[PDB]
Amino acid sequence: MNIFEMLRIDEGLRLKIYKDTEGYYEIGIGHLLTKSPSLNAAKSELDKAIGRNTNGVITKDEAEKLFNQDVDAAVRGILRNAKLKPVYDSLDAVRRAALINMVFQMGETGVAGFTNSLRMLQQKRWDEAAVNLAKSRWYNQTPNRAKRVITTFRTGTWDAYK
């Protein structure tokens, strides 16, 4: 299993602009368009992104293109983040996926804020980390997603995705 499969499962695929549970505008496979509460702004960003007047509806191909770019950006951000890199590099392939999943969902900064959890992951204190990862806003916002990712850090396997 990989990061790409993992995300597709967790983010889903939608061709028309929609709102996430927090009220923000996205499209495709979880591509965030804007946090502004204006559909017109969301369409505007989209057109910019896509390169054409899409009227808020993209194709599956277009969706995939954005998806690849987004995951690439996530990796790149981890790799240049002083606080994310060492942790990331300390991890096995499975757990690296879980870290990229978080970054994709919250951004480099948001993830850099789980000070405690990050410290524990680095020390391989899986169970400990898992508890701290649960004491967060993230966990209350998207509990089923968070559980899955947490278990993956906990176990180092993809069981949670079966």
PDB file of C-alpha atoms in Angstrom:
ATOM      1  CA  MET A   1       0.000   0.000   0.000  1.00  0.00           C
ATOM      2  CA  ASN A   2       1.212   3.477  -0.408  1.00  0.00           C
ATOM      3  CA  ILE A   3       0.633   7.059   0.339  1.00  0.00           C
ATOM      4  CA  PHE A   4      -1.288   7.562  -2.811  1.00  0.00           C
ATOM      5  CA  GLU A   5      -3.660   4.770  -2.064  1.00  0.00           C
ATOM      6  CA  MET A   6      -3.948   5.728   1.511  1.00  0.00           C
ATOM      7  CA  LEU A   7      -4.958   9.324   0.670  1.00  0.00           C
ATOM      8  CA  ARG A   8      -7.397   8.377  -1.983  1.00  0.00           C
ATOM      9  CA  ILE A   9      -9.152   6.309   0.579  1.00  0.00           C
ATOM     10  CA  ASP A  10      -9.115   8.942   3.111  1.00  0.00           C
ATOM     11  CA  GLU A  11      -9.943  11.986   1.006  1.00  0.00           C
ATOM     12  CA  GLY A  12     -12.289  10.577  -1.554  1.00  0.00           C
ATOM     13  CA  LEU A  13     -12.861  11.987  -5.040  1.00  0.00           C
ATOM     14  CA  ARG A  14     -15.328  14.641  -6.047  1.00  0.00           C
ATOM     15  CA  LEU A  15     -15.463  16.551  -9.353  1.00  0.00           C
ATOM     16  CA  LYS A  16     -17.380  19.588  -8.298  1.00  0.00           C
ATOM     17  CA  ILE A  17     -16.405  22.059  -5.599  1.00  0.00           C
ATOM     18  CA  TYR A  18     -17.656  20.933  -2.237  1.00  0.00           C
ATOM     19  CA  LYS A  19     -17.277  21.925   1.438  1.00  0.00           C
ATOM     20  CA  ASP A  20     -15.294  19.755   3.950  1.00  0.00           C
ATOM     21  CA  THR A  21     -16.622  19.233   7.498  1.00  0.00           C
ATOM     22  CA  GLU A  22     -14.978  22.397   8.601  1.00  0.00           C
ATOM     23  CA  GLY A  23     -16.778  24.498   6.007  1.00  0.00           C
ATOM     24  CA  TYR A  24     -13.857  25.016   3.677  1.00  0.00           C
ATOM     25  CA  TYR A  25     -13.887  24.714  -0.108  1.00  0.00           C
ATOM     26  CA  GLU A  26     -12.069  21.802  -1.836  1.00  0.00           C
ATOM     27  CA  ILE A  27     -12.263  19.639  -4.953  1.00  0.00           C
ATOM     28  CA  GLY A  28     -10.862  16.444  -6.436  1.00  0.00           C
ATOM     29  CA  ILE A  29      -8.942  14.361  -3.988  1.00  0.00           C
ATOM     30  CA  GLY A  30      -8.872  16.834  -1.104  1.00  0.00           C
ATOM     31  CA  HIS A  31      -7.321  19.802  -2.893  1.00  0.00           C
ATOM     32  CA  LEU A  32      -8.013  22.808  -0.701  1.00  0.00           C
ATOM     33  CA  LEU A  33      -9.233  25.794  -2.721  1.00  0.00           C
ATOM     34  CA  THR A  34      -9.907  28.418  -0.071  1.00  0.00           C
ATOM     35  CA  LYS A  35     -10.899  29.012   3.503  1.00  0.00           C
ATOM     36  CA  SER A  36     -12.740  32.072   2.505  1.00  0.00           C
ATOM     37  CA  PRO A  37     -16.509  31.608   2.802  1.00  0.00           C
ATOM     38  CA  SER A  38     -17.196  32.592  -0.887  1.00  0.00           C
ATOM     39  CA  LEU A  39     -17.878  30.121  -3.637  1.00  0.00           C
ATOM     40  CA  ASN A  40     -16.774  32.681  -6.222  1.00  0.00           C
ATOM     41  CA  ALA A  41     -13.370  32.933  -4.671  1.00  0.00           C
ATOM     42  CA  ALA A  42     -13.153  29.142  -4.649  1.00  0.00           C
ATOM     43  CA  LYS A  43     -13.975  29.055  -8.371  1.00  0.00           C
ATOM     44  CA  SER A  44     -11.436  31.667  -9.017  1.00  0.00           C
ATOM     45  CA  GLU A  45      -8.692  29.777  -7.319  1.00  0.00           C
ATOM     46  CA  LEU A  46      -9.698  26.641  -9.157  1.00  0.00           C
ATOM     47  CA  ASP A  47      -9.582  28.308 -12.605  1.00  0.00           C
ATOM     48  CA  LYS A  48      -6.188  29.648 -11.672  1.00  0.00           C
ATOM     49  CA  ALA A  49      -5.013  26.248 -10.619  1.00  0.00           C
ATOM     50  CA  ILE A  50      -6.463  24.412 -13.574  1.00  0.00           C
ATOM     51  CA  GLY A  51      -5.612  27.003 -16.064  1.00  0.00           C
ATOM     52  CA  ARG A  52      -9.131  27.403 -17.572  1.00  0.00           C
ATOM     53  CA  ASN A  53     -12.730  28.470 -16.829  1.00  0.00           C
ATOM     54  CA  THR A  54     -14.012  25.260 -15.326  1.00  0.00           C
ATOM     55  CA  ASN A  55     -17.280  26.636 -13.835  1.00  0.00           C
ATOM     56  CA  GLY A  56     -16.403  24.621 -10.684  1.00  0.00           C
ATOM     57  CA  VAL A  57     -16.316  21.153 -12.309  1.00  0.00           C
ATOM     58  CA  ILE A  58     -13.083  19.387 -13.242  1.00  0.00           C
ATOM     59  CA  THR A  59     -12.339  16.087 -14.861  1.00  0.00           C
ATOM     60  CA  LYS A  60     -10.825  13.013 -13.261  1.00  0.00           C
ATOM     61  CA  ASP A  61      -7.617  13.608 -15.142  1.00  0.00           C
ATOM     62  CA  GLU A  62      -7.500  17.126 -13.847  1.00  0.00           C
ATOM     63  CA  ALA A  63      -8.207  15.749 -10.440  1.00  0.00           C
ATOM     64  CA  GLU A  64      -5.251  13.444 -10.595  1.00  0.00           C
ATOM     65  CA  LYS A  65      -2.872  16.035 -11.707  1.00  0.00           C
ATOM     66  CA  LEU A  66      -3.651  18.227  -8.730  1.00  0.00           C
ATOM     67  CA  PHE A  67      -3.492  15.175  -6.438  1.00  0.00           C
ATOM     68  CA  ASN A  68       0.058  14.335  -7.554  1.00  0.00           C
ATOM     69  CA  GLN A  69       1.164  17.869  -7.193  1.00  0.00           C
ATOM     70  CA  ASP A  70      -0.286  18.082  -3.737  1.00  0.00           C
ATOM     71  CA  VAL A  71       1.409  15.038  -2.482  1.00  0.00           C
ATOM     72  CA  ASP A  72       4.650  16.142  -3.954  1.00  0.00           C
ATOM     73  CA  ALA A  73       4.376  19.467  -2.151  1.00  0.00           C
ATOM     74  CA  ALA A  74       3.722  17.725   1.115  1.00  0.00           C
ATOM     75  CA  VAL A  75       6.844  15.654   0.828  1.00  0.00           C
ATOM     76  CA  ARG A  76       8.880  18.605  -0.163  1.00  0.00           C
ATOM     77  CA  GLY A  77       7.656  20.554   2.722  1.00  0.00           C
ATOM     78  CA  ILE A  78       8.556  17.860   5.158  1.00  0.00           C
ATOM     79  CA  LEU A  79      11.954  17.599   3.665  1.00  0.00           C
ATOM     80  CA  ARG A  80      12.736  21.238   4.153  1.00  0.00           C
ATOM     81  CA  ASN A  81      11.239  21.618   7.594  1.00  0.00           C
ATOM     82  CA  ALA A  82      13.754  21.622  10.326  1.00  0.00           C
ATOM     83  CA  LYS A  83      11.357  20.104  12.774  1.00  0.00           C
ATOM     84  CA  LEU A  84       9.707  17.576  10.398  1.00  0.00           C
ATOM     85  CA  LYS A  85      12.711  16.137   8.578  1.00  0.00           C
ATOM     86  CA  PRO A  86      14.624  14.307  11.356  1.00  0.00           C
ATOM     87  CA  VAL A  87      11.465  12.707  12.505  1.00  0.00           C
ATOM     88  CA  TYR A  88      10.511  11.729   9.044  1.00  0.00           C
ATOM     89  CA  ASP A  89      13.880  10.364   8.395  1.00  0.00           C
ATOM     90  CA  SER A  90      13.835   8.337  11.476  1.00  0.00           C
ATOM     91  CA  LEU A  91      10.648   6.517  10.358  1.00  0.00           C
ATOM     92  CA  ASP A  92      10.058   3.166   8.385  1.00  0.00           C
ATOM     93  CA  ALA A  93       8.204   3.332   5.066  1.00  0.00           C
ATOM     94  CA  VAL A  94       4.776   2.768   6.526  1.00  0.00           C
ATOM     95  CA  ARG A  95       5.028   5.363   9.247  1.00  0.00           C
ATOM     96  CA  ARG A  96       6.501   7.913   6.761  1.00  0.00           C
ATOM     97  CA  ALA A  97       3.195   7.593   4.858  1.00  0.00           C
ATOM     98  CA  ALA A  98       1.208   8.379   7.981  1.00  0.00           C
ATOM     99  CA  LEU A  99       3.337  11.490   8.554  1.00  0.00           C
ATOM    100  CA  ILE A 100       2.793  12.685   4.959  1.00  0.00           C
ATOM    101  CA  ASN A 101      -0.986  12.034   5.450  1.00  0.00           C
ATOM    102  CA  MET A 102      -1.053  14.445   8.366  1.00  0.00           C
ATOM    103  CA  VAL A 103       0.903  17.055   6.434  1.00  0.00           C
ATOM    104  CA  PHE A 104      -1.412  16.745   3.552  1.00  0.00           C
ATOM    105  CA  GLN A 105      -4.392  17.296   5.788  1.00  0.00           C
ATOM    106  CA  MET A 106      -2.989  20.090   7.963  1.00  0.00           C
ATOM    107  CA  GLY A 107      -0.024  21.697   6.416  1.00  0.00           C
ATOM    108  CA  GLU A 108       3.640  21.749   7.493  1.00  0.00           C
ATOM    109  CA  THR A 109       2.966  24.222  10.149  1.00  0.00           C
ATOM    110  CA  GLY A 110       0.011  22.636  11.654  1.00  0.00           C
ATOM    111  CA  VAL A 111       1.876  19.348  11.925  1.00  0.00           C
ATOM    112  CA  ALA A 112       5.030  21.024  13.318  1.00  0.00           C
ATOM    113  CA  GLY A 113       2.732  22.069  16.230  1.00  0.00           C
ATOM    114  CA  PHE A 114       2.410  18.453  17.686  1.00  0.00           C
ATOM    115  CA  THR A 115       5.515  19.002  19.671  1.00  0.00           C
ATOM    116  CA  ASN A 116       4.970  16.179  22.047  1.00  0.00           C
ATOM    117  CA  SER A 117       3.776  13.624  19.684  1.00  0.00           C
ATOM    118  CA  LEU A 118       6.598  14.424  17.333  1.00  0.00           C
ATOM    119  CA  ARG A 119       9.086  13.939  20.046  1.00  0.00           C
ATOM    120  CA  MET A 120       7.715  10.542  20.930  1.00  0.00           C
ATOM    121  CA  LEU A 121       7.602   9.247  17.335  1.00  0.00           C
ATOM    122  CA  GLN A 122      11.177  10.140  17.047  1.00  0.00           C
ATOM    123  CA  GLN A 123      11.946   8.091  20.142  1.00  0.00           C
ATOM    124  CA  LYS A 124       9.891   5.147  18.818  1.00  0.00           C
ATOM    125  CA  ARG A 125       7.430   5.392  21.707  1.00  0.00           C
ATOM    126  CA  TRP A 126       4.585   4.329  19.593  1.00  0.00           C
ATOM    127  CA  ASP A 127       1.918   3.764  22.280  1.00  0.00           C
ATOM    128  CA  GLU A 128       2.915   6.951  24.020  1.00  0.00           C
ATOM    129  CA  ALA A 129       2.735   8.938  20.781  1.00  0.00           C
ATOM    130  CA  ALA A 130      -0.575   7.467  19.941  1.00  0.00           C
ATOM    131  CA  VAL A 131      -2.013   8.797  23.153  1.00  0.00           C
ATOM    132  CA  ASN A 132      -0.714  12.299  22.567  1.00  0.00           C
ATOM    133  CA  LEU A 133      -1.751  12.353  18.990  1.00  0.00           C
ATOM    134  CA  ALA A 134      -5.324  11.792  20.285  1.00  0.00           C
ATOM    135  CA  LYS A 135      -5.243  14.788  22.640  1.00  0.00           C
ATOM    136  CA  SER A 136      -5.708  17.246  19.877  1.00  0.00           C
ATOM    137  CA  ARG A 137      -8.227  19.314  17.979  1.00  0.00           C
ATOM    138  CA  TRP A 138      -7.415  17.219  14.936  1.00  0.00           C
ATOM    139  CA  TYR A 139      -8.782  14.136  16.585  1.00  0.00           C
ATOM    140  CA  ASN A 140     -12.101  15.798  17.395  1.00  0.00           C
ATOM    141  CA  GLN A 141     -12.426  17.267  13.923  1.00  0.00           C
ATOM    142  CA  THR A 142     -12.007  14.020  11.921  1.00  0.00           C
ATOM    143  CA  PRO A 143     -11.983  11.102  14.400  1.00  0.00           C
ATOM    144  CA  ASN A 144     -12.317   8.241  12.049  1.00  0.00           C
ATOM    145  CA  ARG A 145      -9.457   9.462   9.809  1.00  0.00           C
ATOM    146  CA  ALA A 146      -7.337  10.267  12.806  1.00  0.00           C
ATOM    147  CA  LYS A 147      -7.876   6.785  14.306  1.00  0.00           C
ATOM    148  CA  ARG A 148      -6.691   5.181  11.116  1.00  0.00           C
ATOM    149  CA  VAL A 149      -3.600   7.254  10.908  1.00  0.00           C
ATOM    150  CA  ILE A 150      -2.979   6.741  14.600  1.00  0.00           C
ATOM    151  CA  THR A 151      -3.141   3.018  14.375  1.00  0.00           C
ATOM    152  CA  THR A 152      -0.739   3.065  11.466  1.00  0.00           C
ATOM    153  CA  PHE A 153       1.780   4.939  13.656  1.00  0.00           C
ATOM    154  CA  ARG A 154       1.010   2.554  16.384  1.00  0.00           C
ATOM    155  CA  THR A 155       1.395  -0.618  14.401  1.00  0.00           C
ATOM    156  CA  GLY A 156       3.531   0.156  11.438  1.00  0.00           C
ATOM    157  CA  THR A 157       1.164  -1.916   9.278  1.00  0.00           C
ATOM    158  CA  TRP A 158      -1.773  -0.991   6.976  1.00  0.00           C
ATOM    159  CA  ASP A 159      -4.340  -2.961   8.936  1.00  0.00           C
ATOM    160  CA  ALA A 160      -6.362   0.076   9.544  1.00  0.00           C
ATOM    161  CA  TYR A 161      -6.908   0.336   5.907  1.00  0.00           C
ATOM    162  CA  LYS A 162      -8.471  -3.124   5.689  1.00  0.00           C
TER     163      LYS A 162
END
